[PDB]
Amino acid sequence: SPWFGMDIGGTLVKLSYFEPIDITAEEEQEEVESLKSIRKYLTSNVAYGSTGIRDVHLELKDLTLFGRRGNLHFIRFPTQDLPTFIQMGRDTVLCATGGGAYKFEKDFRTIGNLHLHKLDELDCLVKGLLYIDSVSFNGQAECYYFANASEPERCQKMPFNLDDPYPLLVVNIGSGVSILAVHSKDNYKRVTGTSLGGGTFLGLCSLLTGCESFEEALEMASKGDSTQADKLVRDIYGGDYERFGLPGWAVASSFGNMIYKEKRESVSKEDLARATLVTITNNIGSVARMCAVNEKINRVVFVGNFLRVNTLSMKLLAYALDYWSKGQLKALFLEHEGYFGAVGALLGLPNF
Amino acid sequence: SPWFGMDIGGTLVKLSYFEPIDITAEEEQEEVESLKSIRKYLTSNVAYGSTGIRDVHLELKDLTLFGRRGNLHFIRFPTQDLPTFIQMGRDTVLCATGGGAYKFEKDFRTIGNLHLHKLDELDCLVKGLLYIDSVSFNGQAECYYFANASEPERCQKMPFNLDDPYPLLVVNIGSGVSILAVHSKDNYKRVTGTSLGGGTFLGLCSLLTGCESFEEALEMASKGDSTQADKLVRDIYGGDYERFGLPGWAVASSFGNMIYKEKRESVSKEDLARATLVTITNNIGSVARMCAVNEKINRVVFVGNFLRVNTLSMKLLAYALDYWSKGQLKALFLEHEGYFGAVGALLGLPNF
Ligand SMILES: Nc1ncnc2c1ncn2[C@@H]1O[C@H](COP(=O)(O)OP(=O)(O)NP(=O)(O)O)[C@@H](O)[C@H]1O
Ligand SMILES: Nc1ncnc2c1ncn2[C@@H]1O[C@H](COP(=O)(O)OP(=O)(O)NP(=O)(O)O)[C@@H](O)[C@H]1O
Numbered sequence: 001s002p003w004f005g006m007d008i009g010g011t012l013v014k015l016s017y018f019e020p021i022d023i024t025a026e027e028e029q030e031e032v033e034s035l036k037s038i039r040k041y042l043t044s045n046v047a048y049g050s051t052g053i054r055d056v057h058l059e060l061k062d063l064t065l066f067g068r069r070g071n072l073h074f075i076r077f078p079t080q081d082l083p084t085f086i087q088m089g090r091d092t093v094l095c096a097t098g099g100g101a102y103k104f105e106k107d108f109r110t111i112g113n114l115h116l117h118k119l120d121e122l123d124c125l126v127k128g129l130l131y132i133d134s135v136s137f138n139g140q141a142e143c144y145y146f147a148n149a150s151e152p153e154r155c156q157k158m159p160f161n162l163d164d165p166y167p168l169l170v171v172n173i174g175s176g177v178s179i180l181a182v183h184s185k186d187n188y189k190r191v192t193g194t195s196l197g198g199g200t201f202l203g204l205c206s207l208l209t210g211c212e213s214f215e216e217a218l219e220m221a222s223k224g225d226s227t228q229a230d231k232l233v234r235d236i237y238g239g240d241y242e243r244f245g246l247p248g249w250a251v252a253s254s255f256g257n258m259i260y261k262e263k264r265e266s267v268s269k270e271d272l273a274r275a276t277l278v279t280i281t282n283n284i285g286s287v288a289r290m291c292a293v294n295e296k297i298n299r300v301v302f303v304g305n306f307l308r309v310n311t312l313s314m315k316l317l318a319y320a321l322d323y324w325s326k327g328q329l330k331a332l333f334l335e336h337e338g339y340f341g342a343v344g345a346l347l348g349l350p351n352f
Numbered sequence: 353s354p355w356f357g358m359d360i361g362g363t364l365v366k367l368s369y370f371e372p373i374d375i376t377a378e379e380e381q382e383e384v385e386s387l388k389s390i391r392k393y394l395t396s397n398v399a400y401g402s403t404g405i406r407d408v409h410l411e412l413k414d415l416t417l418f419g420r421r422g423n424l425h426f427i428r429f430p431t432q433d434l435p436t437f438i439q440m441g442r443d444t445v446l447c448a449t450g451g452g453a454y455k456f457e458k459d460f461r462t463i464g465n466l467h468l469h470k471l472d473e474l475d476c477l478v479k480g481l482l483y484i485d486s487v488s489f490n491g492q493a494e495c496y497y498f499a500n501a502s503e504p505e506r507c508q509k510m511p512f513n514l515d516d517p518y519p520l521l522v523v524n525i526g527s528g529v530s531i532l533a534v535h536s537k538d539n540y541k542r543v544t545g546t547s548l549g550g551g552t553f554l555g556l557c558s559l560l561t562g563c564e565s566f567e568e569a570l571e572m573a574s575k576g577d578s579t580q581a582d583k584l585v586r587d588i589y590g591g592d593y594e595r596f597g598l599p600g601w602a603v604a605s606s607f608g609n610m611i612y613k614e615k616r617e618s619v620s621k622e623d624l625a626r627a628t629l630v631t632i633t634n635n636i637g638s639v640a641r642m643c644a645v646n647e648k649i650n651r652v653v654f655v656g657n658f659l660r661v662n663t664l665s666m667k668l669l670a671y672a673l674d675y676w677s678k679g680q681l682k683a684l685f686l687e688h689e690g691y692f693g694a695v696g697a698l699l700g701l702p703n704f
């Protein structure tokens with residue numbers, strides 16, 4: 001049986017697959033052809049069907065897992081296409097997490113003799129995150145931050161050490177947002193969540209601009225000016241609000257300039273995509289900051305796929321967390337950010 | 353000189369006017385005709401021009417202020433129309449607060465010999481709130497809550513006593529949101545704010561539905577079903593998320609169902625207005641709850657004009673605060689909610 005871990009989210013399915021590379025001569029003979037076919041299918045293709053993608057750059061090579069050497073692969077596809085995944089599977093012990101492990105439990109059992117083991121979405125996140133950081137990203141740091149995020153001429157990606165990783169505030173930006181406080185390897189809690197997450201960005205963007213993909217939404221946002229839609233402190237005060245240390249450039253009301261018909265008529269779709277991204281990102285950062293202060297944690301790590309190929313939101317989070325916390329909180333990021341649940345599910349395999 | 357207090361916000365101008373009713377015989381003779389004309393204009397009309405409105409139901413009658421008996425009147429108009437207000441004024445000591453006291457300072461001084469005194473937007477809010485509650489709403493309570501907000505068959509407006517009003521968390525929902533912690537009559541701080549406020553509701557609603565007024569937006573929202581646009585916990589899990597006590601009906605991703613083209617094509621403008629209102633209101637409630645927990649305050653009062661003629665958002669806030677705090681926080685509301693800054697400005701008059 002192949003070694004998979006699967007995180008079925010509200011939007012994306014994430015799959016971690018361990019490919020053994022220490023296959024001896026006798027082991028190759030005893031391989032059933034269907035097992036050889038899936039290993040060849042998975043390792044010889046980087047696109048699967050029309051919507052599956054292997055993130056080749058994330059591969060962990062020559063990892064020792066469960067006493068065997070192999071490569072750890074990272075694969076994703078839309079949850080909407082899980083039926084075709086299951087159908088392909090019908091013509092193994094599956095550790096699965098995420099809400100879809102429950103929602104589609106009966107669907108997975110249409111695969112004969114398949115054993116589905118459901119694991120909690122946030123236990124898997126914690127164990128997966130701690131594992132990937134512990135084994136490193138092929139010798140490089142898994143964790144990074146943006147040094148000197150206040151000054152754009154100096155702001156640059158730099159590695160960050162998590163060898164004593166506690167305590168830690170984990171902000172999981174998926175369809176929505178879950179916020180976790182991790183005090184030890186076995187002591188963590190979901191502090192709260194917010195429903196203004198990646199699905200809000202993509203859903204509002206699609207309604208406002210007609211964009212057809214996450215990447216197109218980000219491409220529109222990179223070209224826009226959010227201040228065409230947003231009402232700033234200086235639009236209300238004429239400048240800074242000195243008394244409470246609010247700079248004139250801070251957003252006082254997101255989309256607040258859209259109450260005027262003449263401004264709605266001159267705003268571009270790119271401006272609206274950027275205002276949607278800025279609105280969602282700032283709100284996540286603000287909620288993360290309040291939770292950090294309440295939990296007495298100064299290390300805030302952001303994960304989930306809202307931030308994949310999304311440097312605008314990462315830099316916005318880095319700069320805002322540092323600015324609004326007066327330098328007391330650090331925004332941290334991880335290279336394998338969308339995949340920790342799928343990895344943690346895979347790690348549950350010896351328990352079955 | 354007439355006794356005004358004025359709060360010039362990003363969206364609305366709020367004006368409090370004290371009409372003396374103990375005008376003696378000699379005092380009437382010494383009245384300059386222009387002063388008589390403005391008192392008659394203000395008291396004989398409830399609509400001023402095309403956009404000014406006197407909120408007659410809020411009037412405080414037979415109030416003793418600055419040693420005189422009179423009626424306190426509450427008037428509002430869009431900040432966009434302040435030029436016509438100033439122009440009417442050109443063809444007095446003005447205590448003014450809000451951002452527009454700074455932004456339009458030079459405009460007010462086009463009125464000959466007028467003395468403009470700027471006062472801080474949040475000092476005025478605190479002093480105005482404490483004053484109105486102290487004098488009562490013509491003998492009725494100024495403060496109210498929704499009793500038994502968990503059960504709709506029982507949920508009803510009930511008076512609430514603020515005679516020892518400290519400590520208090522004040523949530524000012526205007527264009528944006530300011531959150532204040534009030535520890536004493538002279539000890540208060542702005543804890544934080546959020547830019548997802550009333551202007552976001554109105555701006556997004558206008559973009560999404562084409563509505564032309566705040567009231568039309570609320571009317572559309574009353575007819576919609578936000579779950580057509582929002583992705584719920586049960587859409588992701590198939591039911592409750594038991595492990596972390598998340599009910600199936602909770603919103604996991606606001607507008608998160610709008611990532612699917614077929615759902616964007618079947619959603620109604622009413623559904624989108626309701627999803628906008630629900631999204632903004634829940635986020636305000638969530639931010640208010642985190643601040644309350646951090647400040648160790650269990651009384652949360654919501655003010656600002658986002659909640660005027662907006663019972664949907666008030667009940668949503670009442671129910672959500674009680675549910676998510678497991679009954680530890682009470683949502684409180686005030687009858688004069690949009691006007692406390694304007695009242696507090698008026699109260700600054702003896703200092704000049
Ligand atoms: N190719 C993509 N397709 C869709 N969304 C994408 C894509 N790439 C990035 N995203 C973003 O990533 C978000 C989903 O992130 P993800 O961490 O996979 O959440 P999820 O697990 O599917 N949902 P959840 O059930 O709340 O945990 C989307 O809302 C988008 O903002
Ligand atoms: N007639 C109205 N016109 C416009 N907005 C209205 C109206 N009635 C209610 N509102 C709502 O009330 C909000 C403005 O509330 P208000 O408390 O007056 O803020 P403000 O003081 O003008 N802005 P701010 O500078 O942030 O304090 C708007 O964003 C709407 O959501």
Ligand SMILES: O=C(Cc1ccc(C2CC2)cc1)N1CCN(c2ccc(Cl)nn2)CC1
Nearest residue numbers: 176177193194195604634637638672673676
């Ligand atoms: O966590 C969430 C939302 C959510 C996010 C992600 C997921 C992922 C796991 C699938 C689920 C749910 N919420 C709890 C707190 N909320 C409020 C609302 C009002 C008040 Cl006053 N307070 N809190 C908002 C809802």
Ligand SMILES: O=C(Cc1ccc(C2CC2)cc1)N1CCN(c2ccc(Cl)nn2)CC1
Nearest residue numbers: 252282285286320321324528529545546547
């Ligand atoms: O108060 C505000 C917004 C605001 C609201 C109302 C007004 C009224 C007075 C005119 C002004 C400003 N903000 C401070 C905290 N913000 C963040 C952002 C990111 C992070 Cl990480 N943290 N905090 C958001 C902005």
Ligand SMILES: [Mg+2]
Nearest residue numbers: 009010098174
């Ligand atoms: Mg997820």
Ligand SMILES: [Mg+2]
Nearest residue numbers: 361362450526
């Ligand atoms: Mg205001």
